[PDB]
Amino acid sequence: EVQLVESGGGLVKPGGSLRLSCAASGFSFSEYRMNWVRQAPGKGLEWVSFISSSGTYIDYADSVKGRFTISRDNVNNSLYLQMNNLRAGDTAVYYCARGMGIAVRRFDYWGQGTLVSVSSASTKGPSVFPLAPSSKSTSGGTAALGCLVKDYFPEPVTVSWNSGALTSGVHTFPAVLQSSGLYSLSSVVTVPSSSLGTQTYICNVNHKPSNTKVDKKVEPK
Amino acid sequence: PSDKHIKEYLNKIQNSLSTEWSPCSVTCGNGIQVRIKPGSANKPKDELDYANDIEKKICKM
Amino acid sequence: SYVLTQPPSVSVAPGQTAKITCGGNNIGSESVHWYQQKPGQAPVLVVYDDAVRPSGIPERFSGSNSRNTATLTISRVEAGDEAAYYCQVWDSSTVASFGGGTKLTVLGQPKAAPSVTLFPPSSEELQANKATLVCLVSDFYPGAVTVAWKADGSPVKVGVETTKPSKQSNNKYAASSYLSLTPEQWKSHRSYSCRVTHEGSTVEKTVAP
Secondary structure: OOEEEEEOOOEEOOOOOEEEEEEEEOOOHHHOEEEEEEEOOOOOEEEEEEEOOOOOOEEEOOOOOOOEEEEEEOOOOEEEEEEOOOOHHHOEEEEEEEEEOOOEOEEEEEOOOEEEEEOOOOOEOOEEEEEOOOOOOOOOOEEEEEEEEEEEEOOOOEEEEOOOOOOOOEEEOOOEEOOOOOEEEEEEEEEEOOOEOOEOOEEEEEEHHHOEEEEEEOOOO | OOHHHHHHHHHHOOOOOOOOOOOOOOOOOEEEEEEEOHHHOOOOOOOOOOOOOEEEEEEEO | OOOOEOOOEEEEOOOOOEEEEEEOOOHHHOOOEEEEEOOOOOOEEEEEOOOEOOOOOOOOEEEEEOOOEEEEEEOOOOHHHOOEEEEEEOEOOOOOEEOOOEEEEEOOOOOEOOEEEEEOOOHHHHHOOOEEEEEEEEEEEOOOOEEEEEEOOEEEOOOEEEOOOEEOOOOOEEEEEEEEEOHHHHHHOOOEEEEEEEOOEEEEEEEOO
C-alpha cells in the first residue's frame, strides 16, 4: 500500500539533459521528505539530492551540485529531478526514496529505479584483434589463445571457434560496458601447446546489428 | 543523556511528538522529555532542527 | 560528510551467523542504518537507528553500534540472504552518506582462488594506434574480486574498465579487466601487471613489451 515508481530513464548525449519523475501513492506525499539515490553499474549507492515536505530545504551531493535541480508537486504527489550537462559518471540507476527521521535520517521505502545512460554511442561493429598465445606456455602442455572483440554497440555478439568444431576449452567472457557506451569482450580457448603450428585457430565473431561478420585467424607470434 | 539518545528517541515517537512534553525515555534511570517549542508548532516534522526547534529537559527515575 | 567503510566480501555457510562490519572513527556516536539490495531489485531497509527493525523484517537481522564499528549480524543465514548490504548515516548537520557495500555470499562450494590470464596489445591493434591489455579472471568463489593495474611499479587508474563478476556454467565466477593505453605508453614502461585480490590473497600476472 506504499509504492514509488520512477520514470524518465533513457539514453542521452554527454552535455545533454534529462528529467526523471517519481510518482508516489499510498501515503500523504505532502508531509514526507523525498530523496534521489543513484547507483552506477556494479558500484555502491550514492545519495544525490533531497527535498523537504514543502520544498523550503534542498541539498545536493557535490557530485551533481549546480547541474541537477530537484522539485516536487505535492498536489499530484510527484517528485522530479532535472539533470543538465550530463557526463559519463552520471550513468546509473536512479531511485526515489522516502525520507524518515528528524535529527538522524534514513530511507524507508524505495522504488525499483530508472536507468539513465549517458553515451556518445551508436550502432557500431567491433574491431576484432587476435590474442596470440604467450611464448612462455608455447613449450608445454597447454596454451591460451583468444580474440578481443572491441568497441561495438549494441549487444549482442556471437563468438564461436573453427565454426562450431572447437567447443572444449572455450571461455567467452561477459562484455564490459565502457564509459563511452560501447561494448568490448574477449573469448579464450585453451589448446594443447603441441597443436600450435599444425592446427589453425579462427574465432568467428558475428555482430548482427551491424551486418558485420569477422573470422580472425589467431597465430602464435 | 547523550545527544545520540535524544535523537534516536525522537524518531521513536515521531508520530507522537507534539507541543506538549513526551513520555520520559526511561523506566529505569534517567532520560529526557522532549517537546516542540511553541514557536515552531506549525513546522513540518521532517523540517525540524534538533537544536533550535526542540525543547529538551531531563527526567529522573 | 561522514565516511563509512565496509569489507567488500563476507562469506559463511547456511545456518551459520554472518557479521557485516561498518567502520569509522567514533562511529558509535552516530546512528547507523542498513539496507539489503538483492540483484536487480531496490534496496530494503532492514535496520534503522543502529538496532531497531521495521515491520516485517525477521528477527534474524540485528544491528549494534559500539565504538569504531557498527555491525549488522545475520543469524541462521539462508541462501536468500545472498545480497549486497550498505550501511548509511545522515545526521541532520551534514548530508547523507553510504558505505561501499558488502557482498554477502552463502557458501555452497569450497572457496576457489582465481585463475588469471593477461594478454598484451596485439601488433594489429598497435597498427591502429591503440593498445589494450586484457586481464581475464576466472574460476573463483565467492564472486568478489578487486582488480588493480600497475605500470612498472606505480598504480594506474585511468583507462581501466572492469566488469561485474558473473557466474559461469561451473557455478564459479568470471570477470574481465581492460586497460586502454596509447602505443607510446605501452613501449614507455618496462612492465605492466594485473593484480587480482580475492579473499585476502593475491594473484598477479605480468607482461613486458
